Design an enzyme around this catalytic site. Structure first.
Site, PDB file in Angstrom:
ATOM      1  N   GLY A   1       0.824  -1.197   0.000  1.00 17.66           N
ATOM      2  CA  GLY A   1       0.000   0.000   0.000  1.00 17.66           C
ATOM      3  C   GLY A   1       0.857   1.245   0.000  1.00 17.66           C
ATOM      4  O   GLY A   1       2.088   1.154  -0.019  1.00 17.66           O
TER       5      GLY A   1
ATOM      6  N   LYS B   1       2.472  -5.245   8.974  1.00 20.02           N
ATOM      7  CA  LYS B   1       2.458  -4.029   8.171  1.00 20.02           C
ATOM      8  C   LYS B   1       3.722  -3.219   8.454  1.00 20.02           C
ATOM      9  O   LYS B   1       3.774  -2.453   9.415  1.00 20.02           O
ATOM     10  CB  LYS B   1       1.168  -3.219   8.415  1.00 20.02           C
ATOM     11  CG  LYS B   1       0.921  -2.115   7.390  1.00 20.02           C
ATOM     12  CD  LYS B   1      -0.509  -1.584   7.463  1.00 20.02           C
ATOM     13  CE  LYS B   1      -0.819  -0.597   6.360  1.00 20.02           C
ATOM     14  NZ  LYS B   1      -2.254  -0.198   6.356  1.00 20.02           N
TER      15      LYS B   1
ATOM     16  N   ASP C   1     -11.243   7.785   4.902  1.00 18.40           N
ATOM     17  CA  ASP C   1     -10.875   7.008   3.713  1.00 18.40           C
ATOM     18  C   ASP C   1     -11.613   5.648   3.633  1.00 18.40           C
ATOM     19  O   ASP C   1     -11.014   4.607   3.331  1.00 18.40           O
ATOM     20  CB  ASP C   1      -9.336   6.855   3.600  1.00 18.40           C
ATOM     21  CG  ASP C   1      -8.806   6.471   2.220  1.00 18.40           C
ATOM     22  OD1 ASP C   1      -9.463   6.816   1.208  1.00 18.40           O
ATOM     23  OD2 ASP C   1      -7.719   5.849   2.152  1.00 18.40           O
TER      24      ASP C   1
HETATM   25  N1  LIG Z   1      -3.056 -18.217   4.104  1.00 12.15           N
HETATM   26  C1  LIG Z   1      -2.922 -17.448   3.278  1.00 12.15           C
HETATM   27  C2  LIG Z   1      -2.762 -16.477   2.238  1.00 12.15           C
HETATM   28  C3  LIG Z   1      -1.561 -16.401   1.514  1.00 12.15           C
HETATM   29  C4  LIG Z   1      -1.417 -15.461   0.501  1.00 12.15           C
HETATM   30  C5  LIG Z   1      -2.462 -14.588   0.206  1.00 12.15           C
HETATM   31  C6  LIG Z   1      -3.654 -14.661   0.920  1.00 12.15           C
HETATM   32  C7  LIG Z   1      -4.765 -13.703   0.618  1.00 12.15           C
HETATM   33  N2  LIG Z   1      -4.556 -12.485   1.400  1.00 12.15           N
HETATM   34  C8  LIG Z   1      -4.854 -12.283   2.716  1.00 12.15           C
HETATM   35  C9  LIG Z   1      -4.505 -11.006   3.039  1.00 12.15           C
HETATM   36  N3  LIG Z   1      -4.666 -10.389   4.311  1.00 12.15           N
HETATM   37  C10 LIG Z   1      -4.252  -9.130   4.636  1.00 12.15           C
HETATM   38  O1  LIG Z   1      -3.684  -8.419   3.821  1.00 12.15           O
HETATM   39  C11 LIG Z   1      -4.483  -8.599   6.000  1.00 12.15           C
HETATM   40  N4  LIG Z   1      -4.908  -9.278   7.047  1.00 12.15           N
HETATM   41  N5  LIG Z   1      -5.038  -8.550   8.100  1.00 12.15           N
HETATM   42  C12 LIG Z   1      -4.673  -7.253   7.846  1.00 12.15           C
HETATM   43  C13 LIG Z   1      -4.610  -6.082   8.618  1.00 12.15           C
HETATM   44  C14 LIG Z   1      -4.190  -4.906   8.032  1.00 12.15           C
HETATM   45  C15 LIG Z   1      -3.831  -4.864   6.676  1.00 12.15           C
HETATM   46  C16 LIG Z   1      -3.869  -6.001   5.899  1.00 12.15           C
HETATM   47  C17 LIG Z   1      -4.294  -7.214   6.471  1.00 12.15           C
HETATM   48  C18 LIG Z   1      -3.983 -10.425   1.869  1.00 12.15           C
HETATM   49  N6  LIG Z   1      -4.007 -11.304   0.905  1.00 12.15           N
HETATM   50  C19 LIG Z   1      -3.814 -15.594   1.938  1.00 12.15           C
END
Ligand SMILES: N#Cc1cccc(Cn2cc(NC(=O)c3[nH]nc4ccccc34)cn2)c1
Length: 246
Positions: A17, A36, A127
């Site tokens: 991001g 993050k 946002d």
């Molecule tokens: N297991 C698994 C897995 C491996 C690769 C990709 C994914 C799908 N995926 C899940 C996410 N999750 C997040 O980005 C995510 N989870 N909690 C968060 C808190 C703040 C920002 C982003 C966050 C992003 N892509 C899941």
């Protein structure tokens, strides 16, 4: 709570991001986390900590939760709970053509429950979009980044006056995002063009999967004057009315 860098295991890169990189990891070889890491220059380290500090004192089932802060080593990072399916924007784009209008409305209700909480807490999101919402276990939506002309209300366009009613307009746009299955609001329109169309009275078209009732609420969020927009507490009851009926 404070977390040590030695307590974290960076498994893979899952997002990038404007404010930093997100990684899939583990804390104490136990809990599946989202790390993050800060982007240098993008924001002050003080504001990165304050963002998390605020979030840790806001407890609602529809708002993202943190495990803690890792400050010892730079790049400084925030350790959140893992949201399996990622951002709502990305989860809608892929999975497009599989969603039912009952699921999509339930997502808006999840976000509205969260937003009504922050509204009562006098916390302005500034946002609120599908990209700032996360999908987890059993398609539950949680709001994140609670510390963009296409989501901005007229008070934001010309006078930068944010309120819970400014987030209401944003939520209306988020609703369009949800019922459009991830599509971009004002597709090939410029910032100047978005301001002009809204100022003249034009608004986003009724999305295919949205009903006339869903669009009625969207347009209640898109009222030129903020006093004619419902508060998130009124909005939540409005959406629930269509959820159980038809
Ligand atoms: N297991 C698994 C897995 C491996 C690769 C990709 C994914 C799908 N995926 C899940 C996410 N999750 C997040 O980005 C995510 N989870 N909690 C968060 C808190 C703040 C920002 C982003 C966050 C992003 N892509 C899941």
């Amino acid at each position: 709570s404070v977390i040590d860098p030695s307590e974290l295991t960076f498994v893979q890169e899952i997002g990038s991001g404007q404010f930093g990189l997100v990684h899939l990891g583990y804390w104490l070889n136990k809990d599946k986390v989202a790390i993050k890491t800060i982007r240098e220059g993008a924001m002050s380290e003080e504001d990165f900590i304050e963002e998390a500090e605020v979030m840790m004192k806001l407890s609602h089932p529809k708002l993202v939760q943190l495990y803690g802060v890792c400050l010892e080593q730079a790049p400084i990072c925030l350790v959140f709970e893992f949201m399996e399916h990622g951002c709502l924007s990305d989860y809608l784009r892929t999975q497009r053509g599989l969603f039912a209008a009952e699921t999509l409305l339930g997502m808006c209700l999840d976000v509205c429950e969260g937003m009504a909480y922050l509204e009562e807490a006098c916390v302005i999101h500034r946002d609120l979009a599908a990209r700032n919402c996360l999908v987890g276990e059993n398609q539950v939506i949680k709001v994140s980044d609670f510390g963009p002309v296409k989501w901005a209300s007229p008070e934001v366009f010309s006078f930068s006056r944010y309120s819970s009613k400014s987030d209401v307009w944003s939520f209306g746009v988020l609703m369009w995002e949800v019922f459009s299955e991830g599509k971009i609001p004002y597709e090939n329109r410029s910032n100047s063009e978005v301001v002009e169309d809204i100022s003249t009275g034009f608004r986003l078209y009724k999305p295919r999967l949205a009903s006339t009732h869903v669009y009625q609420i969207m347009n209640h969020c898109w009222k030129e004057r903020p006093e004619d927009r419902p508060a998130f507490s009124r909005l939540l009851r409005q959406l629930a009315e269509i959820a159980e009926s038809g």
